[PDB]
């Protein structure tokens, strides 16, 4: 009769809700803001920190910090503030009545998961908790059990190949290029238009620019060439102040970092080439099913036209005798949440939590021999 709580603590958007549901009830950016000015009024000077949407509304007077950068957690005193805002202030449930399910990118440091379950037990007193891999839940949300997962969140971009039940942990390819690096490259590439976005409160504005304008070209060279004859690729976006900005080739040079990471100096391969590189790390028998089942979770795979370029860029690398199907579900931004609503509400799961009586005798090291 009790329900389970699920909380995808992403790098840019904390999503949370109840198990068995079909949509997250709370979604808010995981920002902690400190005020940085004097505060001359005698009231409204005691509020020392702001979290979530009330920091997103007041971002002009706050230094903004994400506690999660590239999947790992660098500030625990802000992460417990964000979780305390998540459970009480927006979900309005007590943690002691519901078991909780958290989300972790693969190949993370063990100290991150250890301090995460220690904070979840010895501060909020949950009955039971479970941390799951951020990519294995995307296959639950897609309805499948085979396929490789290209989860490109805000912090990290990881490819996990999973045949029917069984993952292949020697082929989990985690690349540190994601939406925050595209946001910083859009800050760097909008300087050539004349616009200077320097503070951390303008990162939100250029993130909104990336939201509503940036698409990815099917072919990059000729689309770059037609931007020289600047006639139809410019687009105007209105700022919060009122000034309009015009954007030309910067509209599609920003997602092209996903397929050419040498633009920001990263010695790596693009997300089309590490996918074929990661399928080739697998065995030759399951390679047919992994080529034909390519799910894409994460918000950074919500650019207009990333499925077409992903298919076109794999099919020049794969052998040309069997098809590639980049299956891109339309709700994929919340996809990591949706599988979290499945696995927590599944009937055969309830003897695979981490109970509090199992934690206090074995310490926080119980989370490694239970989850992965």
């Amino acid at each position: 009769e009790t329900t389970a709580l699920v909380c995808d603590n992403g790098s840019g958007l904390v999503k949370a809700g109840f198990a068995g549901d079909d949509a997250p009830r709370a979604v808010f950016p995981s920002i902690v803001g400190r005020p940085r000015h004097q505060g001359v009024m005698v009231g409204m000077g005691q509020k020392d920190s702001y979290v979530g949407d009330e920091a997103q509304s007041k971002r002009g007077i706050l230094t903004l910090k994400y506690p999660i950068e590239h999947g790992i957690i660098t500030n625990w005193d802000d992460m417990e503030k964000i979780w305390h805002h998540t459970f009480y202030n927006e979900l309005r449930v007590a943690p002691e009545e519901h078991p909780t399910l958290l989300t972790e990118a693969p190949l993370n440091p063990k100290a991150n998961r250890e301090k995460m379950t220690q904070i979840m037990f010895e501060t909020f007193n949950v009955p039971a908790m479970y941390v799951a891999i951020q990519a294995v839940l995307s296959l639950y949300a897609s309805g499948r059990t085979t396929g490789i997962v290209l989860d490109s969140g805000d912090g990290v971009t990881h490819n996990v190949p999973i045949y029917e039940g069984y993952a292949l942990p020697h082929a989990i390819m985690r690349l540190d290029l994601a939406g925050r690096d595209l946001t910083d490259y859009l800050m760097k590439i909008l300087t050539e238009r004349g616009y200077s976005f320097v503070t951390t409160a303008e990162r939100e504005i250029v993130r909104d620019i990336k939201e509503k304008l940036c698409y990815v070209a099917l072919d990059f060279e000729n689309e770059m060439a037609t931007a020289a004859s600047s006639s139809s690729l410019e687009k105007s976006y209105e700022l919060p102040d009122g000034q309009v900005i015009t954007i030309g080739n910067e509209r599609f040079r920003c997602p092209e970092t996903l397929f050419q990471p040498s633009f920001i100096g990263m010695e790596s391969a693009g997300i089309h080439e590490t996918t074929y590189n990661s399928i080739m790390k697998c065995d030759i028998d399951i390679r047919k099913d992994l080529y034909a089942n390519n799910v894409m979770s994460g918000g950074t795979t919500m650019y207009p036209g990333i499925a077409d370029r992903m298919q076109k860029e794999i099919t020049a690398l794969a052998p040309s005798t069997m098809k590639i199907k980049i299956i891109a579900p339309p709700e994929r931004k919340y996809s990591v949440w949706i599988g979290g609503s499945i696995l927590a509400s599944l009937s055969t799961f309830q003897q695979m939590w981490i109970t509090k009586q199992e934690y206090d005798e074995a310490g926080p090291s119980i989370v490694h021999r239970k989850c992965f």
Partner: protein, 168 residues
């Protein structure tokens, strides 16, 4: 824009009911900017602002009563900050109404608009401290001092929020 936040019932019996009174008097106060409510001149807006000032002082009293028994920082500092905000807003509204009344009886739309903006900030502060007092009460219900005030989590009429749209 707190009518979507003011989804409650007549329960709570000390905090929620005056919050609903302040919400309906804001909803009838800011209708004067559209000009189709029961407010005609400017002096009834002064009486309305005096009503919200007295109700905000009473809410400040009740918020001070709940804040004595909260043990430490985690929500008590937030509650004290919103209490200082609602105290500043109500005390500014109180003797900002007086100067507008004395301007009225010694000699015409923006005069209402300043009190409207003050009431809007007061209402945002009061729904913020309603949320903070809910968190502070249902966080520490086993703690001693909270149990004597007799405010269980059932008495608050806060439901779970809406399903967020997955697409668009």
């Amino acid at each position: 824009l707190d009518a979507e936040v003011s989804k409650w019932d007549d329960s709570g019996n000390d905090i929620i009911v005056l919050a609903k009174q302040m919400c309906m008097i804001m909803m009838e106060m800011t209708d004067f900017t559209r000009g189709k409510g029961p407010l005609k001149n400017t002096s009834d807006v002064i009486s309305a602002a005096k009503k919200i000032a007295e109700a905000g002082s009473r809410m400040d009293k009740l918020g001070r009563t709940i804040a004595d028994h909260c043990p430490d920082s985690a929500c008590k500092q937030d509650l004290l900050a919103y209490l200082q905000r609602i105290a500043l807003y109500c005390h500014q509204l109180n003797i900002c109404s007086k100067v507008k009344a004395e301007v009225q009886n010694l000699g015409g739309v923006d005069s209402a608009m300043s009190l409207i903006q003050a009431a809007k900030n007061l209402m945002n502060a009061v729904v913020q401290t309603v949320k903070a007092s809910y968190v502070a009460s249902t966080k520490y219900q086993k703690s001693q001092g909270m149990a004597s005030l007799n405010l269980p989590a059932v008495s608050w009429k806060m439901k779970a929020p809406e399903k967020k749209p997955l697409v668009k």
